[PDB]
Design a protein around this ligand. Sequence first.
Ligand SMILES: C[S@@H](CCCN)C[C@H]1O[C@@H](n2cnc3c(N)ncnc32)[C@H](O)[C@@H]1O
Ligand SMILES: C[S@@H](CCCN)C[C@H]1O[C@@H](n2cnc3c(N)ncnc32)[C@H](O)[C@@H]1O
Ligand SMILES: O=C(Oc1cccc2cccnc12)N1CCCCC1
Lengths: 288, 273
Amino acid sequence: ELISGGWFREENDQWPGQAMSLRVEKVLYDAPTKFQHLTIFESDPKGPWGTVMALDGCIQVTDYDEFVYHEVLGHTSLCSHPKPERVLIIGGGDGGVLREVLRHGTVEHCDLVDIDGEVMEQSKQHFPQISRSLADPRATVRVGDGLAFVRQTPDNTYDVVIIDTTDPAGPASKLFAFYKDVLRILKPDGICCNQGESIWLDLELIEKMSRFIRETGFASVQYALMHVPTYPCGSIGTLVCSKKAGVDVTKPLRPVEDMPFAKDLKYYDSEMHKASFALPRFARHINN
Amino acid sequence: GWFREENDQWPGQAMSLRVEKVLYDAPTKFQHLTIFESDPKGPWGTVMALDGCIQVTDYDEFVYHEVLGHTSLCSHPKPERVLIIGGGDGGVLREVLRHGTVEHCDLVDIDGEVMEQSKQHFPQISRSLADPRATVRVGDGLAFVRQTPDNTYDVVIIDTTAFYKDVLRILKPDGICCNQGESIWLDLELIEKMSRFIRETGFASVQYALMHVPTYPCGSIGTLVCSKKAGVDVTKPLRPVEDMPFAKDLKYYDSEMHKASFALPRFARHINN
Ligand SMILES: C[S@@H](CCCN)C[C@H]1O[C@@H](n2cnc3c(N)ncnc32)[C@H](O)[C@@H]1O
Ligand SMILES: C[S@@H](CCCN)C[C@H]1O[C@@H](n2cnc3c(N)ncnc32)[C@H](O)[C@@H]1O
Ligand SMILES: O=C(Oc1cccc2cccnc12)N1CCCCC1
């Protein structure tokens, strides 16, 4: 029950005895949704973070660093695809991945499906620089379970599927039959990327996912690491998965430097794309 | 029973760790030194802070120590004499001593209480301090370099909490200096100023290497890797660690990570071009 001048505290008993906190300057939303607890607040204006959204007590987006995860998920996937015309985003109700995907001129259409219509509604109201994308005629934004949506999608529908979900503990649980559906709705040159969890907190989950996405039938799976200061332990990654064999996602197939928007990006470029697949030695076995 | 870190220069944000046992908590002649055992159900193990800022934990100390120690020595053609300024915990020293080329390392930390407490509470980090190839001094690094002859060291590593010209001077012509380089999230203007200042004092190149450190503010920190000799590209390894016999003992650093560390987010890339 957040209050202006109080502190928002994030502790996860999955990760016992550590917490991160932000002082609240103004509460904008704090209420149960049909699916999760949604909290939006202006952080201290003497600090850099700007507006903050949390879902079930976990920070999802801040103004100051939202571009990292949205650019990495959107560009690492589309720049690894020869011609990504039709795109699906699962989750992504805030709009960020979709903004990045729609930067690409090859994209004719992007479907977005998020289970929580209130996340879209509140992002339009409170994160206009993230959510501007949701009204693009190139986008179809739907409220629904991603699980059901892919089960009812025909084979060979999408070039790229991006799974921009919350974590395994919540409404995103089965998103970690689903992975076979994703394989099946992808076209032959299909690329899938997901929300891939932390090498510090979730390294065994990452090993398990990578192994079983390969076994499901993807020909290759490479984890891309990125720097996100408001995420637990300061990083997160994405598993970038190719349907087709003989594809090296760790070097850009279509370098963003050749596209008109390269200079508008705040994090991603081809050097960062390459660098993101180099993992600390203790985690390198994910990628080999 | 929690340790809370919030800094006055970054207002309205805090990081906290549960204290299981306070091991040490006293001012020193120089700074406040706190050592505690953190929650045994979490990963961090024993924690050391200096003036309220986490400096080492059992769980992640290998990152910053391997990156400073190896990014610098692997960028040097044959590093035989090394100086560490600060480094009282012994971590950078442990990494530097892995290298067969090293004949001698001097380490000069202003605070002898830090070495003392590190021997008591971080034996995996501080064992290096007793090595026959090391000389450990208690003293201010600023005065130490002023009193050091020209061309004494192949590498100077500044692992801290007139000087830079002294560092330039005490380095041999192929000398490498690396330092504790601050955060691109919280200190980006400091990093630009320092990279410019160092180049101005007369190092020929300065390149910032970014690393992932979960317990540092915003989860990363970097090091400026500075070459005295012009024409040196420190962003690719000069002496790849894979060709040395301890490569597989490392938990973070290798040549891919070395190359990767110099790739900066676009918003920060003007630090390196
Ligand atoms: C906010 S977004 C993550 C923040 C970085 N853009 C995560 C979204 O996943 C949605 N989500 C969670 N589970 C599902 C399912 N099952 N289907 C679709 N969308 C889902 C949830 O409502 C968030 O908006
Ligand atoms: C603990 S170490 C940094 C943690 C990563 N190993 C920071 C050290 O720098 C020392 N320090 C600070 N100022 C100086 C000066 N001027 N000289 C030498 N050592 C110094 C300080 O006592 C710490 O032990
Ligand atoms: O990730 C840390 O704090 C956090 C920062 C950001 C988010 C978090 C979410 C849950 C738990 N913690 C979080 N740490 C780890 C290193 C010591 C300080 C606390």
